[PDB]
Amino acid sequence: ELSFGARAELPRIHPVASKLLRLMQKKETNLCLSADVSLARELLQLADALGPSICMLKTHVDILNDFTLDVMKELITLAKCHEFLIFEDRKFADIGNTVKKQYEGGIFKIASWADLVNAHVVPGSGVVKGLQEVGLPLHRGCLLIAEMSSTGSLATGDYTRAAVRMAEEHSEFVVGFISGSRVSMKPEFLHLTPGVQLEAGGDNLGQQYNSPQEVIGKRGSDIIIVGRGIISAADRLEAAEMYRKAAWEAYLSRLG
Amino acid sequence: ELSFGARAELPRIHPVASKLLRLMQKKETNLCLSADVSLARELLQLADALGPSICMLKTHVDILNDFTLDVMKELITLAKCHEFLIFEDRKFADIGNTVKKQYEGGIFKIASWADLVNAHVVPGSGVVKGLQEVGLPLHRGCLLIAEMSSTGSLATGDYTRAAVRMAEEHSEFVVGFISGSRVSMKPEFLHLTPGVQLEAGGDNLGQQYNSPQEVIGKRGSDIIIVGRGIISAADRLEAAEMYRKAAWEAYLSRLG
């Protein structure tokens, strides 16, 4: 096993993955904030205050009540300042011809501001081929959804294996996975894991939690994605620091 | 097998399914236009001209360059005038807590104007439970994606069976399927089939076509979803009429 900083230099590394791994190493953070808020001002105030603590900020811009492209310009300023990537959690999941338009166009123009997006693999590899027609020229990366943290997830078994093959066959655009554990043996691929809280439990709509120590340390993932464990806390900066320290130490202990 | 008009009266029919089946019977149409355009004016001019020929208009509002809620008000006026349902093809595919916000909120406020939406079943039944928290109070319906028409689709076998069970267990909100064929034996559920053209072939991003006669007549589906076979034709009204007549006659011949 290689450090994040060494993985950033692997021959086949994608440039977006390399940038991410280098800032993870520099800042001692493998935390992705899931900025699940409906107000632009709250999104930007969280990005500014928590920026030093995170490697990545994950958006759902289709839940912002006051989205504009100017908001995303301001988010990019903060991402550049504090050094984190922007990941729009759009879960593209249509045929290739449709997802290319959903990625480039409409009101959101996702490809213009998102370093990373993700896709479900259920449509077959055309979903990746459609996204990459927009994302390759714009030097973007994509994450494939190999597993989900929710109760009754069908992203298991042969479905998960199909995601790894699709990633490993589109490695010029696909930089890794959303997964609950390491699913690829290739160190060039990132593993990002949602369904993370310090305490046991879940929500009332199928979300299930595991700890940073479990998912980074035992399950071999790279990055934790944390929403409500931070966002619902009173002091979101201290909460982010607790999650950062948990994920970072779990990584160091597994690296040995 | 029952006619559309008789299915509209089944004991367990959902009100949105009943409204749809009654207007299908009245208008002799089982065609859903896939209005895959980027301009509001083109969307509205297609809705007005083709409204009499269709049972449903399927949107991707995240591809409109000039989306506003006023555009959707104008679309509703046309839907009421010509008698068709509005189906936003959003393919919700997140955990329940996230999809409820994506359905109700953000810029699009999908639940405020869409009679129907669809969901992938990959997250497990929490995706339906989250949508239904918004959609049940608003008297909306949902379609579950049981199959996809694209090359390499993983919506097969046990995945398709899981979609049918999830639909049949959330029948107060789920009104049917996106599928390539009949997948439920319960006549209360609608089957809508994309990947339809009169001529053989596909696109260069994994789309595959079958004919209206094949999918309605042989494969037992209810409604054809047609995008480019209409949208790319010079005369979209004549193209819509050719698809309507094809799908309607295939239905009548199987009913016998």
Ligand SMILES: O=c1cnn([C@@H]2O[C@H](COP(=O)(O)O)[C@@H](O)[C@H]2O)c(=O)[nH]1
């Ligand atoms: O398998 C999952 C589970 N959750 N999420 C996303 O990660 C965040 C989890 O939020 P939470 O920490 O508040 O539960 C939410 O934005 C959710 O859409 C995923 O991408 N995949």
Ligand SMILES: O=c1cnn([C@@H]2O[C@H](COP(=O)(O)O)[C@@H](O)[C@H]2O)c(=O)[nH]1
């Ligand atoms: O399995 C599929 C295939 N296509 N679509 C959608 O139906 C339309 C198919 O368009 P087409 O007729 O132009 O190929 C597009 O909007 C596409 O997103 C689905 O919902 N499911």
Ligand code: PRO
């Ligand atoms: O010096 C560094 O940060 C990188 C890490 C691995 C080797 N070079």
Ligand code: PRO
């Ligand atoms: O299970 C619960 O409800 C709380 C909230 C998530 C962590 N523990």
Ligand code: PRO
């Ligand atoms: O009269 C009608 O239109 C409906 C159809 C089935 C029986 N009643």
Ligand code: PRO
């Ligand atoms: O296969 C093709 O390219 C054309 C367009 C769809 C139907 N036939």
